[PDB]
Ligand binder design. Structure first.
Ligand SMILES: Cc1cc2nc3c(=O)[nH]c(=O)nc-3n(C[C@H](O)[C@H](O)[C@H](O)COP(=O)(O)OP(=O)(O)OC[C@H]3O[C@@H](n4cnc5c(N)ncnc54)[C@H](O)[C@@H]3O)c2cc1C
Ligand SMILES: Cc1cc2nc3c(=O)[nH]c(=O)nc-3n(C[C@H](O)[C@H](O)[C@H](O)COP(=O)(O)OP(=O)(O)OC[C@H]3O[C@@H](n4cnc5c(N)ncnc54)[C@H](O)[C@@H]3O)c2cc1C
Ligand SMILES: [K+]
Ligand SMILES: [K+]
Lengths: 364, 355
């Protein structure tokens, strides 16, 4: 059938591979082996062999795609990496299907240019399509759970491949069943994602105040998707949230923390504690969602922190939530600064912020 | 109408499970999605309006049609393909739903088996989130291909945008027609988990176990047979639209009032089911407790009676009219309201008639 003569059905194998340059953060160990898969058959056959042979706590493989949400400890000297390069975008009426290794922003653009609305708010988010369901990737008032119909999944332990519905993924705010406290584990691999979009050519309803203002629209109004993408790309540039290899503010894994959901009591206390001398909140179904960025800034961790020095890890000069590599950072530098922001916001507010990126061999 | 078959003066009664309906002016039978879409586009722009709107039809298992609708144009969906594609099953609107179930079981795909024996088409299933025996088609549908009748536009719509709930979806005020349904099923060949007390008991198993889909099917078919809820043309208990009323979802205090009274009278407990938004009661227990036994009325030879095996099913006893169905329905609804304070809601769609 498929690459029968070769190991892993034809996947590329390389040894002693610096992972740092493959990551947006530019942090990482030299991987002992990298196995690069360009098809679903390769991803399945590669993991089957590695999962069948893996015996010890040093042998679980790191599944790696765009490298935009990974903080990988430099200590990990005995690491095998499976790299998902199985790309491919199909248009099927108002449906768009993207293999895991497609570049997510590419899916957005293809969708917009078919006159299909629904992804435009997610323009400029880096990384792969296959990663999007894992944490229900979102920005600017949209999330991929607003349009995903189903996901093609490899269950690594049984070797079964099937399609799973959006409903069975149990999407919530920055979560799904695929999201695990441990980001190495990845017992289930996304091979392909399908989205169902709006063939009338209208964007999703605009649900995010900064974007709405920028287009001179009102809340829940629909607009031209391309115009929405252009505004979103401008909003993201201002925050250093579009990759730009000459700008260190962009040497990140984006926002380092999820917006926390607090009980209505704790929102009203802060609403009071700041009524002397207006507290950002977003609607959410089981409490109030607070802006992590407003919390981080109020606890003293502003844009550029720490300001004095040549700190190798700073918070972005354009967006306080993003940790950045200024040139020579290590994983521990990133974890250290993140811990302090996290500890600091708890000292002030009594809110524990959860990290949004995936920390391999490091914890907070 | 891109090759649609057009018949004139077609009796609808024999096309309905209730054996009630008018002689339609024209029946436009569509055997492809293209015909369905061509027909509805022309007819919907032509209509001038109320009674010129066409009735969308399919399996005839959930409709009560007034016999005096002599000017009725009907579009009958008979696009019937069924495609298996790994663990995905795609069924055109006109496919027989139970054949989709059988086809999935035959391929080793689990998830549809608890829906064995429900009559009518695949296309109709999302409209009221068809279900029984602890399953609903919302548990497996990924998306539905729809014609928006207001814009003439055709598109796939996700499960989520259909807003499925207990006997409802957004399709049940935009008319749309479902053209095709996709289901994602379980290729390990295990059933959905067994959640329904009657079915678990009948298999000798535990709540949450899975079983062979075929054995689940046979159990469910035998239980449905005991209630007159599989089509059997010699049994008048099955000349129905199934359960005529949906299980009402009441605030928890309405439930509690009832459960107190029943405990005092010693005729409890009040059977009830999970609901996100209060407590769901067995409409059948309300009907019987309000005085309307299985076979009601027993006196004389009523042309409409409640099934002798399932009180919730209004049945055509030979020669019923729509007026008889609606007259019996109104009494069962009024009596339940009078005894319990609960307003039951009709499950079938009523064309030219009302409670
Ligand atoms: C400048 C910048 C801006 C950002 N803005 C946003 C934003 O607005 N919103 C947002 O949600 N995120 C944002 N991110 C985070 C990141 O881009 C997204 O999370 C992205 O979806 C990660 O994709 P990746 O392919 O790079 O994942 P990787 O970093 O390659 O992988 C990360 C984790 O996902 C797992 N994973 C990857 N592929 C699969 C698969 N196919 N199946 C199962 N598990 C898998 C990996 O094992 C690992 O556990 C931003 C990042 C940067 C650097
Ligand atoms: C013996 C018996 C047992 C039953 N058991 C059950 C049960 O266990 N659970 C349950 O839910 N139901 C049950 N029913 C009700 C009925 O079988 C289901 O509602 C069925 O899915 C209806 O299918 P149909 O094709 O016969 O619809 P029809 O009767 O042809 O049409 C019903 C309504 O749905 C609309 N409709 C039909 N197809 C479409 C479409 N493609 N797009 C948009 N609208 C459409 C029609 O316009 C009409 O408004 C039972 C019925 C009988 C007679
Ligand atoms: K992030
Ligand atoms: K019914």
């Amino acid at each position: 059938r498929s690459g029968v003569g070769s190991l892993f059905a034809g996947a590329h194998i390389a040894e002693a591979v610096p992972l740092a340059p493959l990551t947006t953060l530019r942090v990482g160990p030299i991987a002992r082996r990298v196995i690069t898969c360009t098809s679903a058959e390769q991803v399945v056959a590669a993991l089957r062999h590695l999962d069948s042979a893996a015996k010890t706590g040093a042998d679980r493989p790191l599944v790696f795609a765009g490298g935009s949400n990974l903080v990988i400890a430099e200590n990990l000297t005995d690491l095998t990496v499976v790299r998902l390069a199985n790309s491919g975008i199909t248009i099927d009426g108002n449906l768009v299907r993207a293999e895991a290794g497609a570049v997510f922003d590419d899916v957005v653009v293809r969708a917009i240019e078919q006159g299909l609305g629904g992804l435009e708010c997610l323009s400029g988010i880096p990384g792969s399509a296959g990663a999007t369901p894992v944490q229900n990737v979102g920005a600017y008032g949209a999330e991929v759970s607003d349009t995903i119909t189903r996901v093609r999944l490899l269950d690594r332990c049984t070797g079964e491949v099937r399609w799973v519905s959006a409903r069975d993924l149990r999407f919530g705010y920055r979560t799904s069943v695929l999201k695990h406290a441990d980001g190495l584990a990845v017992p289930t691999v996304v091979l392909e994602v399908e989205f169902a979009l709006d063939p009338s050519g209208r964007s999703a309803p605009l649900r995010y105040g900064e974007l709405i203002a920028a287009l001179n629209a009102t809340s829940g109004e629909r607009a031209d998707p391309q115009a929405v993408r252009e505004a979103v790309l401008a909003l993201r540039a201002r925050k250093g949230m579009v990759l730009d290899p000459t700008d260190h503010d962009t040497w990140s894994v984006g926002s380092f923390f999820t917006n926390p959901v607090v009980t209505q009591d704790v929102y009203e206390r802060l609403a009071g504690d700041a009524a002397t001398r207006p507290v950002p909140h977003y609607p959410a179904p089981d409490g109030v969602k607070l802006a992590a960025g407003w919390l981080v800034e109020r606890a003293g961790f502003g844009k550029g922190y720490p300001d004095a020095g040549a700190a190798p890890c700073r918070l972005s000069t354009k967006h306080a939530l993003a940790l950045t590599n200024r040139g020579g950072a290590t994983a521990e530098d990133v974890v250290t600064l993140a811990r302090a922001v996290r500890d600091g916001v708890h000292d002030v507010f009594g809110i524990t912020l959860k990290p949004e990126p995936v920390l391999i061999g490091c914890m907070l």
